[PDB]
Design a binder for this molecule. Structure first.
Ligand SMILES: Nc1ncnc2c1ncn2[C@@H]1O[C@H](COP(=O)(O)OP(=O)(O)OP(O)(O)=S)[C@@H](O)[C@H]1O
Ligand SMILES: Nc1ncnc2c1ncn2[C@@H]1O[C@H](COP(=O)(O)OP(=O)(O)OP(O)(O)=S)[C@@H](O)[C@H]1O
Ligand SMILES: Nc1ncnc2c1ncn2[C@@H]1O[C@H](COP(=O)(O)OP(=O)(O)O)[C@@H](O)[C@H]1O
Ligand SMILES: Nc1ncnc2c1ncn2[C@@H]1O[C@H](COP(=O)(O)OP(=O)(O)O)[C@@H](O)[C@H]1O
Ligand SMILES: [Mg+2]
Ligand SMILES: [Mg+2]
Lengths: 751, 635
């Protein structure tokens, strides 16, 4: 009916008193980027803020912080009417009080630390009935605006005086705490959190409206991932941010009871969550309650498993109960708990990527006060293999080193703690450096599924190869309708071949980057491990990982490794199919066409490969990648030298011109040797200057300077003497003969 | 829209059912002025005011399950009706015959194929008293409360004869004996055995059970008098999946572009529960596209608001792109769709296959009178790509038989990971679905993987072809299971296969000739919109020494060039259009709708021969030295 009615969306701008709107809605309401609006909510309560603009905002929604959201008695998905208020009134006296559960460690002064940089250069519109949150001093604290003279709302001016005296009071019985978990505390898994919201938010926010449809909801969700990836966090945050009654079941708490007290507690859990519909039951550590049937010895464990199965079947006669569970891997669960009607939906919460790890480090360092040199982006780029609990432990351990550097001014004030003393505490980059040097991550053995960062500009030349890979990978994704109309089955695999070091892994990562797909890489030793220790279920688990993360590029490096390890041209006997490429063939034949999983293999020895792979339908395209030519090597050297500070070269084109018959690895070797010579000379100069300085004490001219800041032509002219060709001309002759005898042509014009 | 253009004869005492708006609703004709019956005219007025009333105590509900809710398994449902309907509808008339009825039926299949549905529908549509036993509900009780519940179940179903006892998930109650550790589980198994023997002294009680595979049951429950009859409910075919999608979309209201036949043709590996989840998930996407007019009417729901809800084809497209089926690893037993017109030429081969496969089925009396044992196997051989799998599927289509296909990697998996019970399970699947054609592709794969002409040592029989020979020798003649093998290397095959009684007929399939390649190209190009060719016969004439795979490669490369040009034209026209904004002549047209001769003339440059002349020489020499003749007229 009215265009000011809006629905609440998430917060992006991390200021408390800032709401956001889209561009055509603000142009429809005729606002400005410095205005002051008012929001009406439930329970006859309102909130005053400052409206700004946002381009990523949707059409009929509003973006606001959790503080403003909780001050309106509003949850995600409610309705809010907005109105303009030009009544710009400056305040006179502001009387606020702290809350006792958030001040139970601090005492003395609060005005200079918390509030003095809070209102300065802010002009925050406050109102009687608001609770705001101040972070800082390794502590988050909640204040309530108790009394203002311009009732109800006023903009805080420098004319105002703030009487922060008084006793701390308790919480109102209905005011929820900002200590508990919302969507803001979760980082790095935006897609899985959005998927869980799409599954669960509609049968909870609209129970009776969904009851009258005729659509069955989901009734069991199975979260899985490595330990420490925050599954209990996600369950509790989806619980609290929807108002659903959340009951917790802990695995060892039930399995630690007696023989007859476990089933009674399960029955009490499900019967108690009946009466508070809509409810959420979270069964934590489902591996403890119901493991595999062979791992259950006894009768009590099997009675507990059968009791859980009976209750999960009894949910179908119930109404508005969602059951979530969390494991560490799928294959440790009794497979009767995975059929239809019992945990049919599965969500995978993997280890984070670099953007994810940066978001984790920004979440855990809200309250802590960093120094000026601390750059969290380099720390996030350095941590590899760390799950979120490792990053929390890293932040806490660096903060403890920063405390244990100075135990001089800390200890003498023993009875009370003032906030200025902890404001003297500031964490430096050396703290995070030592915390990186001490910590050991837990997910190093896990496989990495992430989008690559290599672009096309790291690769020199090979233009028709780029065109052919864009034809094969990208056109069935962007334009499916053309393949539907012309009636063509799209091809599914590509085999690269060529000399070693010529950039096949870089092309695979670049085409995974151009389509914004995931990338799973499988080396040669991971195939030889399956060869020696005879194990073939791992090949099925690989294609399962590839299907759960579609669209993706699955890259098999060194397919010729087993056929080379078994023998040369003549193996043990009859160099046909082996054990592992057989399972690869069966899984390729069992591949669905709708998933868009694209398989790339790579070899160096195209003649000893199994010929059953190159049959149409498995890997039919062959691409030959040659040694780079005279124009490519410049783009090779510029891509390699982009981090080392080179300077004052005469002719880099001559450097690429003189090297003929060199792969990319040889040019990388030349650049690394030049960097070696530069580091050696720049350490020798520092040692010699320090020795000559200390030999004549009290040096009169202390004028600091860097002797070798950049790499000069002497280093390259020395390092080129150690250059070598990796590929002989007989090998190039063999690849050229395979490329000639591979190609046959008619060349005759039919018309 | 119910009475409009209907002229429905109604009567006082009728209850009718109206579907629509994602809901089925039942109305009762309470009062009419032309008593008892009248045809509804446009002159009529319908007073639909009043309060809703309850149900009469004897009026059964149309919410419960009948035969209409089951799709895709018409044959198995007919077989269960033939087994069960006569001892239920006529109890005392069957009592006075002297024929024993069945007394235990075992349904099995993959999870999600609707076995509880079939049991409940056969229960309700015969009026039999239906008692349900659930496996975990009994195994979740105490030590002494399980056997009392089993005894109460059988004793209570005594008093309401005729009755049906359905034991759901029999794998939970009575597993294999080695998987039972303890004494309580063995007492439950022995109690069930004692009651199933006690049924023989009882009257008019049928016991049904449902498993997930036969081999997880204690084998004492399969002997005579205890679950002797077994019914297999497999995964559905395309007609079956279309019938499932039509059943689950009764109440939902589809849009105009939604074609369920393409959705049924696309879903492969989906059991019926996957199709129900697909329909529900697409309907939830159609709701979550518009949460604008839905939310503002919060207290009540009007049916017109859900009539604005209409599910489009993009909803089913996304639901296909998100869903993952559960029966991809299972073997597919179905009738093929390839006919004889997809294959070019080979006429005497078609005649010989019709003599071998079809004549012992259509005319058994001629083989009885003349006194001939029919042959049982055929071995095709020839160059690769010459259409052996197509001939196997075509002869399975002509006789309307099932088709089980076994590739080369499924034999090499049995070779490397040494396992031979799977060969017996294959012939069991082939006998339970007779008449069928069982096709072994690439019999030479193990003898090629073990070595060339010289293996490891002594290239005689291996491990897996040995089990194939024992199962062929153990084959009954009445079942009509027909076995076809296929090779490319006829000289390294085990000679013990070609002995009379196992695979005695040999057929050589050559490279296709000048007339066949036209029928190859027409069969390949029948989906791609080609146009305005000059001489397709010249296209088939110039290509000499080309198998079917090479011609398929030529057609696929022509389609590649066409798709590339038709994307380049759209990109270039959009760039030139956006470069000069507010384009004054917006006249839409397709640049390349059809494939022209330029694409074929470009793609023929990349053509190649797959088979050399030495290989053709070797197959011709094997065909010559295979054949010996007397050629002498005895009379
Ligand atoms: N994605 C994340 N975002 C923010 N904090 C996280 C994240 N993952 C983990 N943490 C932190 O690490 C703690 C550990 O999370 P948990 O919920 O215990 O993980 P977990 O999956 O439950 O591990 P297990 O298997 O139950 S021992 C959380 O309480 C957070 O403090
Ligand atoms: N052939 C079918 N026709 C119609 N609906 C079907 C069919 N098969 C399955 N369904 C639907 O899917 C649901 C699942 O059927 P079930 O009886 O649970 O299958 P099931 O064999 O019992 O699986 P398990 O092994 O017991 S978990 C049914 O209630 C129907 O809604
Ligand atoms: N064409 C190229 N352009 C740029 N760098 C290259 C090129 N070829 C190889 N390199 C560099 O040399 C190495 C090549 O690695 P990779 O492509 O995996 O080699 P290979 O294909 O022999 O397995 C990497 O250090 C890479 O950066
Ligand atoms: N005689 C034929 N006529 C038409 N197409 C054929 C013929 N033989 C093979 N093909 C084509 O090649 C493929 C079938 O090859 P197939 O006969 O299964 O090969 P193989 O005998 O090596 O197993 C399909 O693309 C099919 O259309
Ligand atoms: Mg946990
Ligand atoms: Mg069932």
């Amino acid at each position: 009916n009215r265009p000011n009615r809006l629905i609440v969306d998430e917060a992006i701008n991390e200021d408390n008193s800032v709401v956001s709107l889209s561009q055509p809605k603000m142009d429809e309401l005729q606002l400005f980027r410095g205005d002051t609006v008012l929001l009406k909510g439930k329970k006859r309560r309102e909130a005053v803020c400052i409206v700004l603009s946002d381009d990523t905002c949707s059409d009929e929604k509003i973006r606001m912080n959790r503080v403003v959201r909780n001050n309106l008695r509003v949850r995600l998905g409610d309705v809010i009417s907005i109105q303009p208020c030009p009544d710009v009134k400056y305040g006179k006296r502001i009387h606020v009080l702290p809350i006792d559960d958030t001040v139970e460690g601090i005492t003395g002064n609060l005005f200079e630390v918390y509030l003095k940089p809070y209102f300065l250069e802010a002009y925050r519109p406050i109102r009687k009935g608001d609770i705001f949150l101040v972070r800082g001093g390794m502590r988050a604290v909640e204040f309530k605006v108790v009394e203002t003279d311009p009732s109800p709302y006023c903009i805080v001016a420098p004319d105002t005086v703030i009487h922060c005296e008084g006793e701390p009071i308790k919480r109102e019985d209905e005011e929820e705490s900002l200590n508990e978990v919302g969507y803001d505390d979760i980082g790095g898994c935006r897609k899985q959190l959005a998927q869980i919201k799409e599954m669960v938010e509609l049968p909870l926010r609209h129970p009776a409206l969904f009851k009258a449809i005729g659509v069955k909801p989901p009734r069991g969700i199975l979260l899985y991932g490595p330990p420490g990836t925050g599954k209990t966090l996600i369950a509790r945050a989806v619980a609290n941010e929807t108002g659903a009654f959340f009951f917790l079941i802990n695995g060892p708490e039930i399995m630690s009871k007696l023989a007859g007290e476990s089933e009674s507690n399960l029955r009490k859990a499900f019967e108690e969550a009946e009466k508070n519909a809509p409810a959420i039951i979270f069964i934590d550590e489902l591996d403890a309650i119901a493991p595999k049937r062979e791992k259950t010895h006894g009768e009590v464990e099997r009675r507990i498993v059968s009791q859980l199965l009976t209750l999960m079947d009894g949910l179908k006669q119930r109404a508005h109960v969602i059951v979530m569970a969390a494991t560490n891997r799928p294959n440790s669960i009794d497979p009767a708990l995975r059929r239809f009607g019992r945990f049919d939906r599965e969500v995978d919460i993997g280890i984070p990527d670099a953007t994810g790890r940066l978001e984790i480090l920004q979440i855990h360092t809200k309250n802590m006060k960093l120094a000026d040199d601390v750059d969290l982006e380099q720390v996030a780029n350095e941590t590899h293999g760390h799950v979120g609990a490792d990053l929390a432990a890293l932040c806490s351990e660096a903060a403890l080193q920063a405390i244990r550097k100075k135990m001089d001014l800390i200890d003498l004030e023993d009875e009370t703690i003032d906030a200025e003393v902890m404001n003297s505490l500031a964490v430096t980059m050396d703290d995070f450096r030592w915390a990186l040097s001490q910590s050991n991550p837990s997910a190093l053995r896990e496989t990495v599924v992430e989008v690559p960062q290599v672009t096309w500009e790291d690769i020199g030349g090979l233009e028709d190869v780029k065109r052919e890979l864009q034809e094969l990978v990208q056109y069935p994704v962007e334009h499916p309708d053309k393949f539907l109309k012309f009636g063509m089955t799209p091809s599914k695999g590509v085999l690269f071949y060529g000399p070693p070091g010529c950039g096949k892994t870089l092309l695979a990562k670049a085409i995974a980057n151009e389509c914004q797909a995931n990338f799973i890489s499988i080396k040669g030793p991971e195939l030889l491990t399956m060869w020696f220790g005879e194990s073939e279920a791992n090949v099925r688990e690989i294609f399962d990982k590839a299907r759960q993360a579609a669209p993706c590029v699955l890259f098999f490096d060194e397919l010729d490794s087993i056929a080379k390890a078994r023998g040369g041209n003549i193996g043990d006997g009859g160099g046909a199919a082996d054990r592992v490429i057989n399972q690869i063939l069966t899984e390729m034949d069992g591949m669905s066409t709708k998933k868009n999983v694209f398989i790339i293999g790579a070899t160096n020895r195209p003649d000893i490969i199994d010929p059953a792979i190159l049959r149409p339908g498995r890997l039919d395209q062959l691409i030959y990648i040659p040694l780079p030519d005279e124009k490519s090597r410049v783009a090779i050297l510029k891509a390699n030298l982009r981090k080392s500070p080179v300077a004052k070269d005469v002719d880099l084109e001559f450097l690429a011109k003189m090297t003929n018959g060199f792969s990319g690895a040889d040019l990388t070797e030349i650049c690394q040797r030049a960097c070696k010579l530069a580091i050696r000379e720049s350490i020798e100069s520092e040692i010699r200057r320090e020795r000559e300085r200390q030999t004549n004490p009290s040096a009169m001219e202390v004028e600091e300077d860097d002797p070798v800041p950049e790499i000069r032509r002497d280093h390259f002219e020395e390092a080129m003497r150690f250059a070598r060709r990796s590929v002989s001309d007989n090998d190039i002759r063999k690849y050229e003969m395979f490329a000639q005898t591979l190609q046959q042509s008619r060349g005759f014009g039919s018309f």
